Amino acid sequence: DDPAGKAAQYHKEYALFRSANMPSPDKLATGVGFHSFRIPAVVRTNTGRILAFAEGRRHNNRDYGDINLVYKRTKSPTNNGENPTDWESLREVVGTGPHTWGNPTPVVDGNTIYLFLSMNDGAYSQNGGNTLPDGTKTKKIDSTWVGRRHLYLTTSTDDGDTWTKPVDMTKTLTPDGQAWDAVGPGNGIKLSTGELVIPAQGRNIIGRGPSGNRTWSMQILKGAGSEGTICQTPDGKLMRNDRPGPMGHRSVARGTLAGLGPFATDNGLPDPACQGSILSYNSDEPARTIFMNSASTDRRTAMRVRISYDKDAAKFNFGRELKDAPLGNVGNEGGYSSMTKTSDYKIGALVESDWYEDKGGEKSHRCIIWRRFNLSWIINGPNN
């Protein structure tokens, strides 16, 4: 038996990024508000402060157009994001121009937080032919310098308070000739041996060097997804657990910094072609890996958090459905997620929610929920 299961269950949940349609919507100090928030990423810093990132999509819920990378921090290093008033007001990492800034993918490295992100020129979209608010039609993302997806890196050495001007690393950390790209979204990791690993489309991005003074390289992968997760399992090996191209199940590969083995579908982890998140919770006995996604082959509204006790994370339990702790007044929960461990031995998770007013159309407002729960809450789930 898992000794953490004997504890009293704990869960608490509330909206952290409140869309423009909601009371007390999240706005920047400049007065800039956002139609939707999507694409969460969360990390605990070495002070205990929590940093929550998202895409602030200004005018509608689409992946293209004027989109800013925004964030909140907990007001103190010690409050663990317990209550809504424990969080600072909305701030911006980068929002310059009419461009798309997004795919936040942070990793904590001692006293430096690195944040990788994707960017495209505001006149371009993944598919092309999309209408922008001014009536212009996007061009299709292509392999030109202006028209491709870029990869940027920004850093903080003051616990997330301020961020360096993002540095364009496309020429060294994205393959030449590539058009569309993505990093994460969600999080990177620091290995037991001290290297940093950031998941990206078709590759890992590897940081080596002393803490806070890293240089970065690509590890090209065969058969990897566009939106990946990375994890160091208790056996010390790396694992990529990726969003599949076709709806069905997660696509998983295992290996080391010298290379990954083949990707293959994991039939224990249904997925509707959506982002997921993964977290190494602890390496001491019993070692646990936590996984969160929508546990369904066709919809995003079946959010499930699970534990694996396997050294290679081969098998996860049923876990618990997040609808067991439902939250009112935030739309229909489900979508992209990100998890961290808090200082008080909870899992903190950001989870997307959709008001669905325009159905799948661009006008449906999107918000992001902050959940905390302990292992007991997962372990003692009714179907677990």
User: Where is the binding site for Ca(2+), in residues?
Assistant: 66, 68, 99
The residue among 68 and 289 lying less far from Ca ion, judged by its C-beta, is 68
Contact pattern from residue 19 through residue 58 relative to Ca ion, giving x for each residue in contact according to CB under 5 A and a dash for the rest: ----------------------------------------
Q: Could you report how far apart the first and last alpha carbons of the chain are, in Å?
A: 13
Q: Which helix (H) or strand (E) holds 294?
A: strand 288-294
The residue among 95 and 166 lying less far from Ca ion, judged by its C-beta, is 95
How many residues touch Ca ion under the rule CB under 5 A: the total is 4
Give CA–CA dist 341/348, Å, rounded. Answer: 6
Q: Which stretch binds Ca ion (CB under 5 A): 67-75, 161-169, 239-247, 326-334?
A: 67-75
CB of 15 to Ca ion, least distance (A): 23
CB of 36 to Ca ion, least distance (A): 14
Write the Ramachandran bin of 53: left for phi over 0, alpha for psi from -120 to 50, otherwise beta. beta
Give CA–CA dist 257/55, Å, rounded. Answer: 30
Told to check if 270 binds Ca ion by CB under 5 A, we report no
CB 182 within 8 A of CB 149: yes
CB of 98 to Ca ion, least distance (A): 6
CB of 152 to Ca ion, least distance (A): 13
- In angstroms, what CA-CA distances link 344 with 77, 82, 93, 187, 347? 12, 10, 27, 20, 9
Q: Which stretch binds Ca ion (CB under 5 A): 68-76, 125-133, 164-172, 324-332?
A: 68-76
Q: Which stretch binds Ca ion (CB under 5 A): 95-103, 204-212, 249-257, 342-350?
A: 95-103
The residue among 99 and 243 lying less far from Ca ion, judged by its C-beta, is 99
The residue among 95 and 207 lying less far from Ca ion, judged by its C-beta, is 95
Q: Write phi, then psi, for 76 (nearest 5 degrees).
A: -125, 160
Q: Which stretch binds Ca ion (CB under 5 A): 61-69, 179-187, 277-285, 304-312?
A: 61-69
Bridge partners, 219 (sequence order): 204
- Which of these, 132, 29, 56, lies nearest to 365 by C-alpha position? 56
Binding-site annotation: residue ranges: 66, 68, 99
CB of 59 to Ca ion, least distance (A): 11
CB 55 within 8 A of CB 38: yes
The residue among 44 and 99 lying less far from Ca ion, judged by its C-beta, is 99
CB 79 within 8 A of CB 86: yes
The residue among 117 and 295 lying less far from Ca ion, judged by its C-beta, is 117
Told to check if 66 binds Ca ion by CB under 5 A, we report yes
Told to check if 95 binds Ca ion by CB under 5 A, we report yes
Q: Which stretch binds Ca ion (CB under 5 A): 65-73, 81-89, 145-153, 266-274?
A: 65-73
Give CA–CA dist 36/363, Å, rounded. Answer: 9
CB of 216 to Ca ion, least distance (A): 25
CB 16 within 8 A of CB 368: yes
Q: Which stretch binds Ca ion (CB under 5 A): 87-95, 131-139, 164-172, 250-258?
A: 87-95
Q: Is the dihedral of CA 210, 197, 167, 36 positive or negative?
A: negative
CB of 96 to Ca ion, least distance (A): 6
Give CA–CA dist 240/251, Å, rounded. Answer: 8
Q: Is residue 382 reached through a cis peptide bond, with omega within 30 degrees of 0 on the bond before it?
A: no
Give CA–CA dist 39/351, Å, rounded. Answer: 9
CB of 100 to Ca ion, least distance (A): 7
Residues 119-158 touching Ca ion, rule: CB under 5 A, are none
Q: Site residues (CB under 5 A) for Ca ion? A: 66, 68, 95, 99
